[PDB]
Amino acid sequence: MIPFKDITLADRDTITAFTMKSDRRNCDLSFSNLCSWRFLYDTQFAVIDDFLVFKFWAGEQLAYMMPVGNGDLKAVLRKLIEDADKEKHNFCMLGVCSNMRADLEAILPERFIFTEDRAYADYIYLRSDLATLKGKKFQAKRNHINRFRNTYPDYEYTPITPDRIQECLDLEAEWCKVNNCDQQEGTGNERRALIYALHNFEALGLTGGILHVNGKIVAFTFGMPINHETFGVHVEKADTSIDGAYAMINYEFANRIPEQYIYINREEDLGIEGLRKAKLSYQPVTILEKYMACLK
């Protein structure tokens, strides 16, 4: 029996030892994302034949993350299929990128059914693009930040520190309530994941920023590295009454992301029309498809 263990804060070194050196850019491999969503998926992990593997329960559905590492993929797949068999479920893997799909097909030709939903693709950008907003592609973004600067000349950006967390939580609840975000699917779950992240901010290895206008917090954002060259921005929330607050905090935080992080992953659009429009407006270099791969 694979000795799957519940993921915890204390597993940060073990997990990032695999992910940081990997070529995997999927935001679901962020240590903060894995821990913060454990309440929903009863998330577990194991290291099997030099691969890091995650196991998730989503109601009736059992799924495993595409194994992270190098080594004998066939051997690890045999063990995961046996694990699914023990659970009396068909074997399904999530987070399979295009390269991973090719690797699976090579081991078990015709055995996997691959399904993809563009709602779940990640948007990846150049840090240099988001931090500088240089070039014609970013002209409107420059206009937004210049307009913000003109409207709110006394704004203040500060990094998130443990001392600033509870206010971020209180404010997030207030903003949601204004937009009646109760009545939007999934916001309760998103709130649980936000709370865990902010409560355990330092242990997780998150960094983040807060925007203030006229002496009050009006936006906050946080994230952490996904791999050696990709930083994930996991959350970005703002007081919707403040025009340009999203654009401004994006820009300020991008400039605090260490320069080794070539890429910034700002996650998925969830098939929401307005969100897809917003994420495409920042000119992603890659839209990172994620397949589910289920044994036939």
- Which residues are known binding-site members for CoA? 175, 190, 246
Question: Which residues neighbour 26 within 8 Å (Cβ) at sequence distance 6 or greater?
Answer: 95, 97, 122, 226, 265, 288, 290
Please state, as a whole number, how many other Cβ atoms lie within 10 Å of the Cβ of residue 30: 28
Q: Which of 181, 275, 287, 295 binds ligand COA (CB under 6 A)?
A: 275
Residue 119 touches ligand COA, criterion: CB under 6 A: no
From the DSSP assignment, how many helices (H) and strands (E) are in the chain?
12, 15
Please list every residue from 50 through 69 that binds its own copies, using CB under 8 A: 57, 60
Do residues 234 and 224 lie in contact, with contact meaning Cβ atoms separated by under 8 Å?
Answer: yes
Residues 164 and 210: beta-carbon distance below 8 Å: yes
Residue 86 makes contact with its own copies by CB under 8 A: yes
Residue among 28, 83, 172, 190 that touches ligand COA (CB under 6 A): 190
Least distance between its own copies and beta carbon 43 (Å): 10
Torsion from C-alpha of 78, 83, 84, 86, nearest 10 degrees: 130
Q: Which of residues 225-244 bind ligand COA (CB under 6 A)?
A: 238, 240
Q: For residue 285, what are the contacts with CB-CB under 8 A and spacing of at least 6? A: 124, 125, 126, 129, 263
Told to check if 181 binds ligand COA by CB under 6 A, we report no
Asked if 159 interacts with ligand COA (CB under 6 A), we say: no
Eight-state DSSP code of residue 21: T
Q: Give residues preceding each break in the chain, C–N over 2.5 A.
A: none
Q: Which of 119, 270, 280, 285 binds ligand COA (CB under 6 A)?
A: 270
**Cα(58)–Cα(121) distance, rounded to whole angstroms?**
19
How many angstroms separate the CA atoms of 150 and 169, rounded? 28
Between 35 and 245, CB nearer to its own copies: 35
Q: Given the rule CB under 6 A, which of 73-81, 97-105, 250-258, 270-278 is the region that contacts ligand COA?
A: 270-278
* 195 makes contact with ligand COA (CB under 6 A): no
**Which 212-241 positions form the footprint of its own copies (CB under 8 A)?**
none
> Which residues of the shown chain bind ligand COA in the complex (CB under 6 A)?
179, 186-187, 190, 238, 240, 270, 272, 274-275
Give the interface with its own copies as residue ranges (CB under 8 A). 5-6, 8-10, 35, 38-40, 42, 57, 60, 86-88, 162, 166, 173, 195-196, 199
